[PDB]
mmCIF file of C-alpha atoms and ligand atoms in Angstrom:
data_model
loop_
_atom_site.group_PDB
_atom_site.id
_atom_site.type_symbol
_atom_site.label_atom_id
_atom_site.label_comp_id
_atom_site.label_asym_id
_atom_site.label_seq_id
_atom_site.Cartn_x
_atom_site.Cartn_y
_atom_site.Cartn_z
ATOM 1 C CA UNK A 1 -30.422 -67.140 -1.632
ATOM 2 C CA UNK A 2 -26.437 -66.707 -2.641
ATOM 3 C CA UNK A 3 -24.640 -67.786 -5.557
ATOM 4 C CA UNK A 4 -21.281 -69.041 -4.594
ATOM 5 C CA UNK A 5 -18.370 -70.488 -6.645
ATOM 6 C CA UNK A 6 -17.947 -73.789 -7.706
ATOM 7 C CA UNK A 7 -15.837 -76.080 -10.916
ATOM 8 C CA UNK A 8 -16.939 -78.757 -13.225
ATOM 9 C CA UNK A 9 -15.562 -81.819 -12.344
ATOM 10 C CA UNK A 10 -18.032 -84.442 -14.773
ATOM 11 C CA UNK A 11 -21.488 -84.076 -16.103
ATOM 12 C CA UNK A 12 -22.964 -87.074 -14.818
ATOM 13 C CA UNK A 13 -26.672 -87.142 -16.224
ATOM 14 C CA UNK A 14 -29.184 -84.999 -16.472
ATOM 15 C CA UNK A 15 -29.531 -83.606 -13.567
ATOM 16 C CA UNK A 16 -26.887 -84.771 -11.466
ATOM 17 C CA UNK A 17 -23.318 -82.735 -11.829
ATOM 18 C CA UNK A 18 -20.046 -83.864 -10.408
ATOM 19 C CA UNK A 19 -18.580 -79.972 -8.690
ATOM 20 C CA UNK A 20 -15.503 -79.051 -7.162
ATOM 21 C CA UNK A 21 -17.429 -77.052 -3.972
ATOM 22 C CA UNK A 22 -15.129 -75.226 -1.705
ATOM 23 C CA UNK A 23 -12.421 -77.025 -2.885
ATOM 24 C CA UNK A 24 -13.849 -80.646 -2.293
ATOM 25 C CA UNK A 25 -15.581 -83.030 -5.078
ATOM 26 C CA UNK A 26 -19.227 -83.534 -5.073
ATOM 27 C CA UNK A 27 -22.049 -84.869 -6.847
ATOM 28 C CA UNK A 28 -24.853 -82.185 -7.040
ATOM 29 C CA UNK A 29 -28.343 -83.306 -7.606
ATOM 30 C CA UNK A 30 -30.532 -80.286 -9.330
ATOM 31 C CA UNK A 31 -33.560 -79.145 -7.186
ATOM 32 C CA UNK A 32 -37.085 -79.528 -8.298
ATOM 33 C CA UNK A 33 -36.959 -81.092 -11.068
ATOM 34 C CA UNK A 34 -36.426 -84.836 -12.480
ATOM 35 C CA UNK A 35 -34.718 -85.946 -15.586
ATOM 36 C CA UNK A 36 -35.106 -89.532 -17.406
ATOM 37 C CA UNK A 37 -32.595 -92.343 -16.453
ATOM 38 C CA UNK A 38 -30.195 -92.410 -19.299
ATOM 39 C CA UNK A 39 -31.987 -95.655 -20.132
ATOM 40 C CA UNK A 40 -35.560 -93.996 -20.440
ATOM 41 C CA UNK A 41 -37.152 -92.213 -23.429
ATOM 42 C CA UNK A 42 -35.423 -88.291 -23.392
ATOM 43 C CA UNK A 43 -32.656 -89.725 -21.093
ATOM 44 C CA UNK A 44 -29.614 -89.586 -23.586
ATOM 45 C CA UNK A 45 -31.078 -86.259 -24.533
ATOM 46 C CA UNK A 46 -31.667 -84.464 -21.336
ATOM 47 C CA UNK A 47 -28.081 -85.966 -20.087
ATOM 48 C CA UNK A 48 -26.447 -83.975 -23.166
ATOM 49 C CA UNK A 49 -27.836 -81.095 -22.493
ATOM 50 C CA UNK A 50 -27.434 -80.892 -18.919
ATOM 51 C CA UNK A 51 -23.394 -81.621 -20.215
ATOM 52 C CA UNK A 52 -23.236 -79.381 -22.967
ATOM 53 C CA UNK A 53 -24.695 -76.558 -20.645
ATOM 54 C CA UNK A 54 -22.382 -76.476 -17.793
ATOM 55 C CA UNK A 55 -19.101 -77.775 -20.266
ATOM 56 C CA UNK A 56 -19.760 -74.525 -21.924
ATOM 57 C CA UNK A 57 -20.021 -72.856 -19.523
ATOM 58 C CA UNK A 58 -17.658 -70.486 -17.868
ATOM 59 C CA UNK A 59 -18.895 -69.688 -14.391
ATOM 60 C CA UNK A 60 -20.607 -72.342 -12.848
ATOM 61 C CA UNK A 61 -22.376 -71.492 -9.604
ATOM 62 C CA UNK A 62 -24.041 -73.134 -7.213
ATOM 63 C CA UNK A 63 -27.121 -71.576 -5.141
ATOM 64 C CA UNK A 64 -28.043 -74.062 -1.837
ATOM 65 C CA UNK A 65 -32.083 -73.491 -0.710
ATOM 66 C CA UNK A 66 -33.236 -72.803 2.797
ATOM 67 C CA UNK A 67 -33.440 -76.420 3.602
ATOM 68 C CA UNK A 68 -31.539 -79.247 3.451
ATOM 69 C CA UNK A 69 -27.965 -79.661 1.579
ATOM 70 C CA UNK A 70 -27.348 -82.861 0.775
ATOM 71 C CA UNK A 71 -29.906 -85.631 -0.111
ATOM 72 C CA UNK A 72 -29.750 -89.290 1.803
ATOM 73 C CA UNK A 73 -27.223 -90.262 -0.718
ATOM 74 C CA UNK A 74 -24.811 -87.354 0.517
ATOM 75 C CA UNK A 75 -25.313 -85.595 -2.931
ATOM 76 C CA UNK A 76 -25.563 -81.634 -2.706
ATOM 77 C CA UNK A 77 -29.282 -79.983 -3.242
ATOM 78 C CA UNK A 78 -29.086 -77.064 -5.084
ATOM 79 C CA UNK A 79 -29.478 -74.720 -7.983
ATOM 80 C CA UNK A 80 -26.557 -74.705 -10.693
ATOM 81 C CA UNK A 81 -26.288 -71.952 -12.639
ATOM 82 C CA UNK A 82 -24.109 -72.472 -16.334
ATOM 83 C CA UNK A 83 -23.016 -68.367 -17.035
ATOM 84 C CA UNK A 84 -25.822 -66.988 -15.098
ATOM 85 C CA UNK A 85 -28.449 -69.415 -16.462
ATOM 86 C CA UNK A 86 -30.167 -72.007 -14.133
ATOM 87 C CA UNK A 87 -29.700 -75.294 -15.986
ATOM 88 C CA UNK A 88 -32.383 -76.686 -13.453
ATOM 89 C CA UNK A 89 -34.876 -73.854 -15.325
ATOM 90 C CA UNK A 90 -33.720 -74.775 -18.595
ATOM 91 C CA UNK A 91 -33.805 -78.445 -18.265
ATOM 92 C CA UNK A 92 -37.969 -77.926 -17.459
ATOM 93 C CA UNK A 93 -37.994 -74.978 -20.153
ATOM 94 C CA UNK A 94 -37.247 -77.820 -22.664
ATOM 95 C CA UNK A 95 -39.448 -80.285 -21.633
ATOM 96 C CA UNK A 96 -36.067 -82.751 -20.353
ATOM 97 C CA UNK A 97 -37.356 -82.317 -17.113
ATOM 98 C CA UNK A 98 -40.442 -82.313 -14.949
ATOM 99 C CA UNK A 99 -40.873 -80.667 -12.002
ATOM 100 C CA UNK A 100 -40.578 -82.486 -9.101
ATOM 101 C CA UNK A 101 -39.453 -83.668 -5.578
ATOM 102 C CA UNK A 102 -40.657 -80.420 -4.422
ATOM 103 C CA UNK A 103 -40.305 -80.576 -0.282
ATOM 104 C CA UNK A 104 -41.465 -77.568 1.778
ATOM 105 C CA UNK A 105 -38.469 -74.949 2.737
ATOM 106 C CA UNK A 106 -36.323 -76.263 -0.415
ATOM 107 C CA UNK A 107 -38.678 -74.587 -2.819
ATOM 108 C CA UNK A 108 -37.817 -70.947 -3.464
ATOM 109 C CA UNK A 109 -37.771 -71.534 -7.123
ATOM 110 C CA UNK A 110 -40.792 -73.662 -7.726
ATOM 111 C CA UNK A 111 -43.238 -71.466 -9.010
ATOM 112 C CA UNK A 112 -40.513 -70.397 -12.139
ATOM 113 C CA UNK A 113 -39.680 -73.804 -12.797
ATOM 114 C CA UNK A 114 -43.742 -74.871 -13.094
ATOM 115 C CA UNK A 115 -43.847 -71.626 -15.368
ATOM 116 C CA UNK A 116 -41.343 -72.881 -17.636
ATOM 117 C CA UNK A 117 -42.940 -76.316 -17.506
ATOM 118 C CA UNK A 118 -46.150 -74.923 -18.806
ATOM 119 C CA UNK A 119 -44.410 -73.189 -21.593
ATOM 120 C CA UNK A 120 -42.495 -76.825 -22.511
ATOM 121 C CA UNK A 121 -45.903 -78.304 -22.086
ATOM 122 C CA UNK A 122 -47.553 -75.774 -24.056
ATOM 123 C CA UNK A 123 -45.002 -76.199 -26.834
ATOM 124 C CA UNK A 124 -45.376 -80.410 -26.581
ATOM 125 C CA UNK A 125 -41.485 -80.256 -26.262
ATOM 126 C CA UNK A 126 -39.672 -83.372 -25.956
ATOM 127 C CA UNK A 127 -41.411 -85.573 -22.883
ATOM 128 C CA UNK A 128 -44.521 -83.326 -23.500
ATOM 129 C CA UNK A 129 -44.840 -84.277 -27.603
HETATM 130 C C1 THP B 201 -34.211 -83.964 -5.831
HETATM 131 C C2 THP B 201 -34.184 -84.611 -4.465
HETATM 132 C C3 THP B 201 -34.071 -85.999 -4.408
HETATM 133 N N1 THP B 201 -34.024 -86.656 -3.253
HETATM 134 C C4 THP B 201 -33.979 -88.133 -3.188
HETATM 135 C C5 THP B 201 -35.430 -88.619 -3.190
HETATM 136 C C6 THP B 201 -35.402 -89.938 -3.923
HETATM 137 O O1 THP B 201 -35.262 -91.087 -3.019
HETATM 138 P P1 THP B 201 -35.264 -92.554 -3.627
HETATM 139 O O2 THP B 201 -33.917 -92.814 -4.202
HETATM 140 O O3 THP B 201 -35.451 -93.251 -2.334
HETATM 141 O O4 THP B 201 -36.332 -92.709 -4.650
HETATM 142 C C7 THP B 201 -34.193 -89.770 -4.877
HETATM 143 C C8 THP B 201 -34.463 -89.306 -6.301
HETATM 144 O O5 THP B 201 -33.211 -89.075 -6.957
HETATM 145 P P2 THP B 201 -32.913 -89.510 -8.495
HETATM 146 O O6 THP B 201 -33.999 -88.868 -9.343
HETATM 147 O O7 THP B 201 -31.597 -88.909 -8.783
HETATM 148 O O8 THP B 201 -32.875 -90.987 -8.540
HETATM 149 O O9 THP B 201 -33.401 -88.786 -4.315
HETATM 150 C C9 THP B 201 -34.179 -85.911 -2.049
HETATM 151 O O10 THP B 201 -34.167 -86.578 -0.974
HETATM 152 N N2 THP B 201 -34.288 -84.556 -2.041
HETATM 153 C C10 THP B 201 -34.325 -83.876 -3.193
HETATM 154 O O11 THP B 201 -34.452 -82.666 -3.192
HETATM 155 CA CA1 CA B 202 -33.624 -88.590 -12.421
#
């Protein structure tokens, strides 16, 4: 898997990301995990972090899996990474995120993320209190 360059454009919620990706605007949705609707309980909270993460940032990245791309909705699949950090990782790390939609070949980081979600869980953060 490769890093490759990409801009903030908006933070959308918490885990979708509007990117400028080789040069073109898209909306990235995060792999593996799944963050409450803004509506739902933890969904104003795991939207401002997802925002505060990659507004802070200074690098943003984006790292595509061995599968597909884009989702149905023609939203990019991929890991985004806030200054080296995977906000997808620390979304589940704080228990703002569960693991999830995990299809076969776009997987590569599933067994960190459920590692991370056992430490949230373990720690009753957030959805897990
Ligand atoms: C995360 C992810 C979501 N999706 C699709 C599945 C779901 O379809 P449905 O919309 O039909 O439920 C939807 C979940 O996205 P949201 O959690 O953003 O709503 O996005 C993929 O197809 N691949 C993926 O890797
Ligand atoms: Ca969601």
């Amino acid at each position: 898997l490769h890093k490759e360059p990409a801009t903030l454009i908006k933070a959308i919620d918490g885990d979708t990301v509007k990117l400028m990706y080789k040069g073109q605007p898209m909306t990235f949705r995060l792999l593996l995990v799944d963050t409450p609707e803004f509506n739902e309980k933890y969904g104003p909270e795991a939207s401002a972090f997802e925002k505060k993460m990659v507004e802070n940032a200074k690098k943003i990245e984006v790292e595509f899996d061995k599968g597909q791309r884009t989702d149905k909705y023609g939203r990019g699949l991929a890991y985004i990474y806030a200054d080296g950090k995977m906000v997808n990782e620390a979304l589940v790390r704080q228990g703002l995120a569960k693991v999830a939609y995990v299809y076969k070949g776009n997987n590569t980081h599933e067994q960190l993320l459920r590692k991370a979600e056992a430490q949230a869980k373990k720690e009753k953060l957030n959805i897990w209190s």
